[PDB]
């Protein structure tokens with residue numbers, strides 16, 4: 001629909017701007033929201049940042065993290081929606097879409113182009129890369145704090161330069177930002193080395209319960225609610241567990257069953273090279289992306305949800321192995 | 324002492340053996356192979372060796388079979404990369420009183436055991452020094468050589484997570500990816516290749532994990548019987564101590580490892596300020612400000628652990 005130049009001109013034409021990110025905010029969301037907000041503020045615009053969700057604790061030390069609001073009181077001329085592929089993903093702020101002109105900036109190919117202006121380019125690994133280019137086009141001078149905030153999303157959305165999307169442009173952007181003072185160590189420490197001690201004792205139980213299925217192609221484990229309690233943990237402590245189980249040699253699908261609170265079992269699935277876990281997840285009542293999906297069961301017994309999910313996963317997997 | 328001197332020595336010799344440290348890591352493999360392939364571009368006869376089994380995670384890398392264990396060779400020059408002392412190259416230290424030697428390394432504790440020593444602790448990886456040597460030698464990089472040279476920069480920075488991941492690290496990474504370094508291949512092979520048995524071993528490491536200095540220090544240990552119980556080797560525990568440092572508030576993580584039997588290794592990683600190389604040096608080892616280790620021979624793990632902890636705590640309070 002629109003290109004960066006059109007977005008830059010729209011941003012220049014408006015002064016009271018609300019920058020909105022997607023719910024359940026990750027590094028790229030926080031990075032893209034704050035990097036654009038601060039850039040626009042440096043231009044003298046009246047800007048507020050909003051995400052309809054609690055900002056996770058791992059961001060607590062980041063400069064200007066306080067600028068992201070859950071309940072802003074603001075009368076914007078322009079809504080800028082970043083890193084969100086559809087209106088439901090910005091929560092209660094979608095109710096502004098028919099009241100305020102909107103810009104969309106996103107790297108998700110599934111983006112519905114729900115804005116009055118839409119710059120969507122999936123060749124970027126992170127929306128933060130697109131914000132970096134917008135700020136440059138606007139003449140934003142980066143300091144170390146803004147460089148760190150813009151580096152954040154490029155790091156997290158590439159798995160810290162490990163995913164298949166970490167191409168030359170990603171590494172060029174990272175080099176440029178570190179040269180401007182981005183604190184790569186700070187970012188990694190706060191995002192990746194911020195685990196409660198109790199999470200490690202919980203993870204030990206996960207690993208003791210770990211089992212492989214179907215020629216070591218499927219790995220699964222489970223956390224019952226009483227095991228969370230025993231280690232003084234919640235589902236906040238176990239978020240990164242399923243991705244670790246995917247790193248087993250030969251495993252194509254990792255599955256983790258997580259009962260928290262009691263009776264509520266969330267099932268996370270991650271795949272590696274080819275298996276579309278979103279299809280299995282959707283058929284079980286959930287959904288997601290081809291390599292990362294999930295499904296929630298409410299008011300059920302974990303010992304009954306595990307067979308239910310594994311039986312269907314195994315059927316779909318063998319069907320996929322065949323043709 | 325400087326790169327230019329090393330380049331001159333390398334140019335003078337046409338039969339060269341390139342050796343790295345035992346218990347090889349990514350920087351060792353990267354530096355050995357990148358320099359070996361670079362020197363071959365000059366028409367030289369070059370062999371690569373490590374006196375140790377090459378870990379499984381490297382087996383799909385291009386030219387990995389060029390690293391030998393028992394080279395059949397009469398070199399004119401020995402080039403030692405990424406090793407801080409003669410003991411760390413195993414049987415090849417026997418060459419040091421016979422063949423002229425070059426040392427290229429980034430450990431602050433290097434004993435300068437070569438005839439020529441280029442030691443620069445400001446580099447995050449020896450592989451950064453090899454990259455510069457190769458370009459000074461005039462070598463042109465194809466994508467396989469770029470991948471091999473990228474490897475060590477990635478692994479010795481914990482894939483751009485350690486405090487040594489500075490602007491020069493990101494410059495080198497960008498330049499190598501621009502020349503075809505497959506960053507994703509490197510990450511998959513090194514980080515997504517864990518044996519199932521490694522996770523069972525790690526579970527015991529986590530069961531034994533303890534905090535000291537009221538949360539600022541974390542440590543665990545693997546006695547030899549526990550490696551055997553889980554059908555594991557030092558290959559399986561390679562990344563463990565870095566994981567222990569990911570505890571919120573921990574400044575230094577320590578892992579004691581007995582492998583093979585009668586070889587007790589201490590691996591230390593620190594986060595923000597504690598100089599673990601000072602501790603390691605005083606115990607007979609060495610390393611970098613944020614990553615260091617020592618190996619003890621003929622000791623009992625039940626005696627090594629409390630004495631090392633005691634010294635670590637002494638140095639921590641002095642820090």
Ligand SMILES: [Ca+2]
Pocket residue numbers: 015044045046
């Ligand atoms: Ca103004």
Ligand SMILES: [Ca+2]
Pocket residue numbers: 055
């Ligand atoms: Ca908060």
Ligand SMILES: [Mn+2]
Pocket residue numbers: 026027028029083
């Ligand atoms: Mn995001």
Ligand SMILES: [Mn+2]
Pocket residue numbers: 028029083107125126127157
């Ligand atoms: Mn994103």
Ligand SMILES: [Mn+2]
Pocket residue numbers: 344347348349350351405
């Ligand atoms: Mn090394």
Ligand SMILES: [Mn+2]
Pocket residue numbers: 350351405429447448449479
């Ligand atoms: Mn090294």
